[PDB]
Design a binder for this molecule. Sequence first.
Ligand SMILES: [Ca+2]
Length: 223
Amino acid sequence: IVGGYTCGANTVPYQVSLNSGYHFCGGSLINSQWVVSAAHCYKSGIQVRLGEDNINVVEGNEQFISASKSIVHPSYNSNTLNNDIMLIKLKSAASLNSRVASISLPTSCASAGTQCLISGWGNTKSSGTSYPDVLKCLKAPILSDSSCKSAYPGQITSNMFCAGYLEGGKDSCQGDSGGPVVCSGKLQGIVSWGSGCAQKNKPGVYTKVCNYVSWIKQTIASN
Ligand SMILES: [Ca+2]
């Protein structure tokens, strides 16, 4: 997250870190056994880390649980990032409490101008590289369809939306991928892609979660 702020320990209790001997992506806990992330974060050997703030210090509150299933959307396209969504089943159920909690799925899609919360342990620099210890947060609005498409001609599908700031300086970034965009208590977005990060006129592009609610529920119910 570039241009964000320190969330504070366990203030985003649905935020998870996907770990493969190192933090590589975020995710969102949607029930005690299931995490939503990005398809482009897929790999085998995923360990899900819940209840994290400082990802480099064992603070108390952590639960480390291996992924038993990692399910990429069947129509995921790795060139366009259309359908950039993955469901991870946990080997055992997480223990839910104030510091480890699920986030609700949308009942409808959010609107342009709606303010959301984006979070992760990704790069904090628009030019170089700096990875934080603690979880970073950013408040960002959903942009209009047309603005998003003007920013990224021919690349925005109906399963994507733009959020953030056209002036530069405030965005998600590498290492935030798969993490949450929460608006009015609902998981509306997944950190997906963008041109660089926090670059002028290149806002963040997010997987549009409201299109996948039925797919999520059926996939969960079948597995
Ligand atoms: Ca920790």
